[PDB]
Amino acid sequence: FRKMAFPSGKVEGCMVQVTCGTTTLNGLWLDDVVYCPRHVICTSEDMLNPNYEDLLIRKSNHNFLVQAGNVQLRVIGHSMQNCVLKLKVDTANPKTPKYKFVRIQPGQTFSVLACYNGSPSGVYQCAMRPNFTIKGSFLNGSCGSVGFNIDYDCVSFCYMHHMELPTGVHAGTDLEGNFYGPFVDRQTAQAAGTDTTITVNVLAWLYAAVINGDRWFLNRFTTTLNDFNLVAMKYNYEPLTQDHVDILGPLSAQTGIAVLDMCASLKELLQNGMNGRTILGSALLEDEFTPFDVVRQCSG
Amino acid sequence: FRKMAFPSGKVEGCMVQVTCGTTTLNGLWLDDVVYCPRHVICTSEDMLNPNYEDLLIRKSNHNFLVQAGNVQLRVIGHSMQNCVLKLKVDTANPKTPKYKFVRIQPGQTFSVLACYNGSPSGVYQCAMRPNFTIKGSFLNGSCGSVGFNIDYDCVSFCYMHHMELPTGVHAGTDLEGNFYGPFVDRQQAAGTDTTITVNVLAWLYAAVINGDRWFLNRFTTTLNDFNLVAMKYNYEPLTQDHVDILGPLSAQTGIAVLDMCASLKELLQNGMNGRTILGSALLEDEFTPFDVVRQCS
């Protein structure tokens, strides 16, 4: 069972390079607007306490170099929305997909297209952590890389990349420029709040392992929802809600394992460990597959 | 470290569907040729022990329905190369990238663009196991999905999907239609699998690059002595090509390949002794030397 990203071609056709001064990162070109992180306008010194409105009013359209492949796009206007800059260009992107901007919830997954100098480099699946970080793979120059889901022909953009934290996890914004989490686009070492494990996702994954013939971790027992949730919170697992239980129905039907029966299996794993065994290849309980993800991939 | 696929857009621009009767699978459209698994020409009854040569003689161009989306592509010629069908079409694919056809070695990784009815569903990284199988996520209708790597702007196609083995792993061919491994497109067991030594060594190099180097020792080994030990632990023997592709990581860390082999040999013989490497007690074997350099840089 495989962590699978959405096909990235519709997003690749939107990625451009944005340069201001000696800073280069990526931008997302939709119709005649390029979206990018606003910290592109900051210098070494600005970045410790950047007064962005004051820094932006001092910029001219020609201070922004936007390049799509070999071609330069002419910036004819700019504006700032929260932590994103919106560069109006004189050319429409003919590869603009059907799209929307969404703000995702913790526990939801999305695909990241990691880009450098406006060129796509890799694609992988991430989850919005309960503490609003993401465990990404982002190096210098990756800012402006985006995260997205696809439904039919519509790209739902949910993430734009801005920073890496001292622990090696990542933080960013939605496409309205609002950060996920308590982070700020200044050049400071920032810690996240305590992370927790996405319980509804671990349960989806356990069901996926059953669907794939792996059942060593099952047991004959059950648990109530509240008693499960007491043990969950003790182990820094998120509470499981009745909506989560409802969401897991399809995987429950399929396998004929009641949700609360799988909860009792997970409780045993938290208390007893895996004893060196592995599940779906992993020595660790995996929490970045949603129920939808498991079903979407057991469906086609 | 994450499994990271290559961006799939250049390959999405080449996917089509190929139907013969009611059997639809995926094909790859490059210039004026569509490549797909030859078993598209088989009914269920032929799938037992098909006579592909006979089946292909009974076929004509007008029996093949090739479609990009719902747009038919006219077939003007057909031929068989090993286990792939090549359909000449009357239109050169305007989205053809720079490409080549490569046959990869066990241990090498590649991106799979899983497709159904010519439409991409997902992309993910696979490693060719030493027993010439991959652990895919392939369902009915996935055949003809391809595996690839991208270098600069050149797509190297290395895999086309054909079948699922009893144990739930996957087998297929290169783009010249030669199966990886001893498999045939009929109605077979994968050889017992082994650990991909060259990738474990890449993973130890990765750990060193990140400052996790407790396992380095003061000794070395010959390649023969290491290979003989490794096989007792169900690890693949190293080839000269493996030594060579570890060269960049050896040079980045200053740790000779054979010195790293001696460190690995000690881990195998003594175990981890309760310690971890890059946070795990398990040694990862699905990241190549190129994967490591690509994520550390």
Ligand SMILES: *[C@@H](O)[C@H](C[C@@H]1CCNC1=O)NC(=O)[C@H](CC(C)C)NC(=O)OC[C@@H]1CCC(=O)N1Cc1ccccc1
């Ligand atoms: C895109 O411009 C980059 C992307 C990051 C670079 C390395 N990996 C990334 O994901 N974004 C930035 O560099 C951020 C810019 C500010 C928001 C203005 N800054 C940033 O990511 O800082 C990262 C460094 C490295 C690790 C860390 O903890 N850190 C913060 C820091 C800052 C100052 C002193 C000490 C630590």
